[PDB]
Amino acid sequence: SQSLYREIHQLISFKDVLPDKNLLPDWSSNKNPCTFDGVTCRDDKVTSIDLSSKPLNVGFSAVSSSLLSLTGLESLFLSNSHINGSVSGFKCSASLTSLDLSRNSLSGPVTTLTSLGSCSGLKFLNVSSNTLDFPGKVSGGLKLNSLEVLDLSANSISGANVVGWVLSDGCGELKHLAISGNKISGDVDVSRCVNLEFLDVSSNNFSTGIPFLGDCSALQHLDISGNKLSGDFSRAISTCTELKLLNISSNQFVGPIPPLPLKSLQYLSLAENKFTGEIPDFLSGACDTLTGLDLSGNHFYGAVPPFFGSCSLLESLALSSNNFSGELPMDTLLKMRGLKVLDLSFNEFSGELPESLTNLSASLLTLDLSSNNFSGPILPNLCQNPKNTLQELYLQNNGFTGKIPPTLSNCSELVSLHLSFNYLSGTIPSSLGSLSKLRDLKLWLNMLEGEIPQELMYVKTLETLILDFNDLTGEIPSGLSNCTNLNWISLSNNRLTGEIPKWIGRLENLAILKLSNNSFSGNIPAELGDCRSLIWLDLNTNLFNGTIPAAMFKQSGKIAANFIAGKRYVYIKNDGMKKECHGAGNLLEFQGIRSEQLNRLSTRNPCNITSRVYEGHTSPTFDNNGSMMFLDMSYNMLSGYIPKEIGSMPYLFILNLGHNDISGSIPDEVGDLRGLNILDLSSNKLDGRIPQAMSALTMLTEIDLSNNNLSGPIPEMGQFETFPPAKFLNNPGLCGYPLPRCD
Ligand SMILES: *[C@@H]1O[C@H](CO)[C@@H](O[C@@H]2O[C@H](CO)[C@@H](O[C@@H]3O[C@H](CO)[C@@H](O)[C@H](O[C@H]4O[C@H](CO)[C@@H](O)[C@H](O)[C@@H]4O)[C@@H]3O)[C@H](O)[C@H]2NC(C)=O)[C@H](O)[C@H]1NC(C)=O
Ligand SMILES: *[C@@H]1O[C@H](CO)[C@@H](O[C@@H]2O[C@H](CO)[C@@H](O[C@@H]3O[C@H](CO)[C@@H](O)[C@H](O[C@H]4O[C@H](CO)[C@@H](O)[C@H](O)[C@@H]4O)[C@@H]3O)[C@H](O)[C@H]2NC(C)=O)[C@H](O)[C@H]1NC(C)=O
Ligand SMILES: *[C@@H]1O[C@H](CO)[C@@H](O[C@@H]2O[C@H](CO)[C@@H](O[C@@H]3O[C@H](CO)[C@@H](O)[C@H](O[C@H]4O[C@H](CO)[C@@H](O)[C@H](O)[C@@H]4O)[C@@H]3O)[C@H](O)[C@H]2NC(C)=O)[C@H](O)[C@H]1NC(C)=O
Ligand SMILES: CC(C)[C@H](C)[C@@H](O)[C@H](O)[C@@H](C)[C@H]1CC[C@H]2[C@@H]3COC(=O)[C@H]4C[C@H](O)[C@H](O)C[C@]4(C)[C@H]3CC[C@]12C
Ligand SMILES: *[C@@H]1O[C@H](CO)[C@@H](O)[C@H](O)[C@H]1NC(C)=O
Ligand SMILES: *[C@@H]1O[C@H](CO)[C@@H](O)[C@H](O)[C@H]1NC(C)=O
Ligand SMILES: *[C@@H]1O[C@H](CO)[C@@H](O)[C@H](O)[C@H]1NC(C)=O
Ligand SMILES: *[C@@H]1O[C@H](CO)[C@@H](O)[C@H](O)[C@H]1NC(C)=O
Numbered sequence: 178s179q180s181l182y183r184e185i186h187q188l189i190s191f192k193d194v195l196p197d198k199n200l201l202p203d204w205s206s207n208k209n210p211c212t213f214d215g216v217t218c219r220d221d222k223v224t225s226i227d228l229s230s231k232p233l234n235v236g237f238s239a240v241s242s243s244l245l246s247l248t249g250l251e252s253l254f255l256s257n258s259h260i261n262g263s264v265s266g267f268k269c270s271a272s273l274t275s276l277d278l279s280r281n282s283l284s285g286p287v288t289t290l291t292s293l294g295s296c297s298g299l300k301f302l303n304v305s306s307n308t309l310d311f312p313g314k315v316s317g318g319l320k321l322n323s324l325e326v327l328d329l330s331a332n333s334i335s336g337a338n339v340v341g342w343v344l345s346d347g348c349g350e351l352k353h354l355a356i357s358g359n360k361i362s363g364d365v366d367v368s369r370c371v372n373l374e375f376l377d378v379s380s381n382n383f384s385t386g387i388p389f390l391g392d393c394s395a396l397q398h399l400d401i402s403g404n405k406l407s408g409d410f411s412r413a414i415s416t417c418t419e420l421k422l423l424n425i426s427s428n429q430f431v432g433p434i435p436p437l438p439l440k441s442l443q444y445l446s447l448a449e450n451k452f453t454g455e456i457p458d459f460l461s462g463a464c465d466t467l468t469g470l471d472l473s474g475n476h477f478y479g480a481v482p483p484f485f486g487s488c489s490l491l492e493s494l495a496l497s498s499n500n501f502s503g504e505l506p507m508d509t510l511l512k513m514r515g516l517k518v519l520d521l522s523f524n525e526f527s528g529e530l531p532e533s534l535t536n537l538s539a540s541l542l543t544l545d546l547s548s549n550n551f552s553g554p555i556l557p558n559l560c561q562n563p564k565n566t567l568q569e570l571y572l573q574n575n576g577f578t579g580k581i582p583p584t585l586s587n588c589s590e591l592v593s594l595h596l597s598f599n600y601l602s603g604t605i606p607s608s609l610g611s612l613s614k615l616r617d618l619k620l621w622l623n624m625l626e627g628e629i630p631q632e633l634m635y636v637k638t639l640e641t642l643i644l645d646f647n648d649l650t651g652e653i654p655s656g657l658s659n660c661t662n663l664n665w666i667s668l669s670n671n672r673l674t675g676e677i678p679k680w681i682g683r684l685e686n687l688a689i690l691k692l693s694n695n696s697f698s699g700n701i702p703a704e705l706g707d708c709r710s711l712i713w714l715d716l717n718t719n720l721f722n723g724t725i726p727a728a729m730f731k732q733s734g735k736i737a738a739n740f741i742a743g744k745r746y747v748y749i750k751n752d753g754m755k756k757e758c759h760g761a762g763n764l765l766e767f768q769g770i771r772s773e774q775l776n777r778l779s780t781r782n783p784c785n786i787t788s789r790v791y792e793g794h795t796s797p798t799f800d801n802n803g804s805m806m807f808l809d810m811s812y813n814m815l816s817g818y819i820p821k822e823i824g825s826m827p828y829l830f831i832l833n834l835g836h837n838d839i840s841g842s843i844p845d846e847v848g849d850l851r852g853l854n855i856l857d858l859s860s861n862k863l864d865g866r867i868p869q870a871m872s873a874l875t876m877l878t879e880i881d882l883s884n885n886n887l888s889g890p891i892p893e894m895g896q897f898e899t900f901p902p903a904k905f906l907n908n909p910g911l912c913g914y915p916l917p918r919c920d
Pocket of ligand 3 (some may be wrong): 253670671694718755758759779781782783786
């Protein structure tokens with residue numbers, strides 16, 4: 178057959194235009210393509226090709242001429258294959274059914290896809306996650322009316338009535354339409370698409386009309402979430418009898434929960450809206466089929482109605498961030514056999530934990546009661562039932578008292594324990610080290626005393642250890658060296674003593690290290706510069722002495738921070754008003770806690786919290802090849818001179834070496850820190866002239882060189898003219914504006 182001779186030559190030609198050789202090493206001439214990797218054959222004839230997740234790095238023109246023209250080819254999967262360029266006219270095999278070009282660098286107007294109409298048998302098309310757009314006026318049509326499945330999601334499409342453009346030539350055969358994650362706005366009319374089952378217009382710019390669904394005869398999945406929609410969606414979906422999933426979350430809908438089609442409903446999300454009232458009784462109509470419910474981020478109140486006990490298929494119930502009050506409805510919750518996730522966080526649920534809660538320790542994967550008015554002791558009988566399935570236990574930001582039950586070790590599947598922000602006293606039970614799967618241990622802001630258990634070394638999966646603001650004494654356990662997956666360690670505000678161990682450098686995943694307000698002594702380890710992930714170091718208010726090692730900045734430029742991202746935090750800026758407040762600012766973990774309860778720190782901290790709070794999710798300014806972003810060693814007994822290597826950290830935002838015994842002169846390399854915002858070298862024995870090179874710093878919003886032996890003229894260029902005289906005071910030999918003219 179000529180087609181067989183043609184098949185092999187086209188495949189090999191495609192291999193040869195690949196910039197990277199050896200990418201398809203088993204592809205070779207004078208061999209049967211059915212033996213090639215990525216190829217699928219039926220009766221010794223290629224029917225499908227899959228080169229997904231291979232960095233092909235070639236233009237679409239290569240694909241179209243070599244691959245899409247192959248006789249008998251039924252499907253082609255090139256997802257995440259690093260293909261760029263634009264789609265354009267080409268001869269397409271009439272047998273081609275599915276084409277996946279998702280997650281690539283395809284560019285140009287979305288009108289380029291119309292040329293795929295040369296594929297007569299095309300039915301499935303995935304061009305999601307590319308850079309396709311819609312320049313200027315929207316006119317004409319996509320003109321692919323034979324498609325059953327189309328995914329234009331996560332592109333750069335921006336325009337009004339782009340959906341109408343897609344459906345202009347007809348949607349009679351269309352079963353699945355996803356256009357999510359764009360900037361499309363205007364009207365959505367799928368009433369002519371009588372076989373439509375899946376519709377996702379989420380994360381767009383729709384601010385006016387709700388999609389018109391017509392008879393809505395075949396619709397099962399409807400996602401309009403992540404828009405600016407308001408109005409009466411109830412009436413719009415009222416005719417949809419086959420509806421299974423309804424996601425209207427993150428919109429501007431108001432009022433009480435309206436009527437919904439419940440008979441086939443599996444998933445329902447009303448989350449992140451302006452809905453009010455209490456959970457109506459009529460929702461019991463979904464209890465036969467309802468798998469998941471999310472009412473979070475609204476103004477709902479009252480108590481969880483009793484009818485929920487009839488929903489035995491409900492796997493997930495999220496009522497977080499509302500005004501639900503009363504005690505824990507253990508009556509209804511025990512009637513739900515299939516519930517694996519309970520989230521009542523950020524509510525006003527009050528009272529002590531009922532003893533029947535222990536029954537859900539063998540059922541629930543996630544129990545989140547964080548930020549509530551719960552009081553009394555933590556149930557010691559928690560996880561009494563054998564084979565406990567509990568993974569996440571969030572009890573933070575409550576009125577819990579007493580001791581941490583050592584019995585919590587009986588929950589062996591626990592990956593996250595958050596007991597922070599409570600009135601818990603006693604010590605940390607050493608049995609917690611017996612948790613082989615534990616990743617996050619957060620107990621901060623409690624009255625916990627004693628020492629940090631040495632037995633924690635038996636947790637090789639440990640990632641975050643947050644013990645801030647307790648009465649913890651003793652030294653850092655030598656066994657923590659065995660936890661190599663540690664990224665976030667914060668032991669600040671305790672009475673901890675000893676030194677930073679030399680094995681600290683052996684933690685290659687360590688990103689944040691905060692030891693402030695302790696009695697830590699000794700010298701700063703040179704092995705701190707063996708940490709490849711460290712971007713945040715806060716050692717302020719300790720007994721550290723000796724000279725700053727130059728080697729600690731050795732990884733500068735090599736730093737890689739990845740796993741640290743995505744974690745919720747508060748950063749409380751230091752108000753320079755009060756002398757009792759130390760450090761540049763307080764970085765603290767803040768998952769599942771209200772900023773409104775930050776006043777609980779008032780008794781434990783001298784700093785004023787008023788208008789100095791920054792809240793977000795950890796977001797490094799780089800991925801690989803970065804540097805330390807934060808460095809604070811202020812209020813210590815550090816001596817010697819600042820090493821010139823200090824200026825090797827271009828991503829450093831803040832540098833506070835204030836209140837030390839550091840001598841010498843400010844190195845000229847400080848002027849190479851081009852990302853620097855704050856620079857506090859005040860209250861030291863620094864002498865000499867301020868290096869003119871510091872005039873190159875364009876990002877400084879704050880500086881303090883006061884209380885030093887600095888002399889000579891202040892640099893006249895740069896940002897020095899911006900800063901007030903107060904920042905240079907108590908420097909006898911220092912002159913020039915903002916100070917008086919030199920003599
Ligand atoms: C068009 O292409 C896009 C891009 O691929 C595609 O979106 C992606 O769909 C896949 C599913 O095929 C998603 O991947 C899943 O992610 C969830 C978590 O959200 C995982 O739990 C899933 O794991 C399953 O699959 C794995 C192997 O694939 C198994 O190892 C595992 O045990 C589970 O069985 C699954 O990986 C992905 O998140 C999205 N988004 C992306 C990739 O950006 C879209 O679906 C395509 N359109 C159509 C109509 O198919
Ligand atoms: C019900 O609907 C809600 C709301 O839509 C939904 O929660 C959302 O899930 C989506 C996942 O599909 C989230 O989308 C991502 O969010 C992250 C976090 O910020 C972003 O970084 C992501 O950005 C990428 O994707 C964009 C395209 O969407 C790209 O333009 C961008 O460059 C990135 O590649 C992405 O937006 C979304 O954040 C949440 N929203 C909320 C409020 O939780 C929920 O999953 C739905 N539930 C069901 C069962 O369908
Ligand atoms: C390092 O950690 C130690 C130990 O936590 C810490 O010492 C604490 O400092 C706070 C900050 O002031 C002290 O809090 C005080 O406690 C007394 C009770 O003895 C309160 O009466 C005080 O209340 C004042 O503030 C209230 C509102 O904020 C007012 O209503 C009231 O009238 C007072 O003005 C005050 O809060 C705490 O007592 C000490 N504890 C100990 C054991 O020393 C230290 O500050 C930390 N160091 C650094 C640099 O952070
Ligand atoms: C990488 C993470 C651990 C880190 C928290 C990161 O997520 C977060 O964005 C950090 C970089 C933020 C949190 C607080 C921010 C600072 C907030 O408070 C600071 O005083 C302001 C003051 C001034 O505005 C400076 O221009 C920025 C500056 C100095 C910000 C520098 C960057 C931050 C320090
Ligand atoms: C496609 O990617 C290659 C590889 O970098 C590049 O040389 C080429 O210019 C790109 N084409 C377009 C149209 O951007
Ligand atoms: C959303 O739509 C409005 C109205 O057409 C428009 O003014 C606005 O620019 C759009 N937003 C984006 C991000 O394109
Ligand atoms: C939340 O509910 C409680 C219950 O009594 C009520 O006192 C409080 O005012 C409610 N919150 C708001 C903002 O109305
Ligand atoms: C630092 O303090 C320790 C005692 O805590 C002392 O032995 C050591 O000599 C000091 N370092 C310097 C450089 O003086």
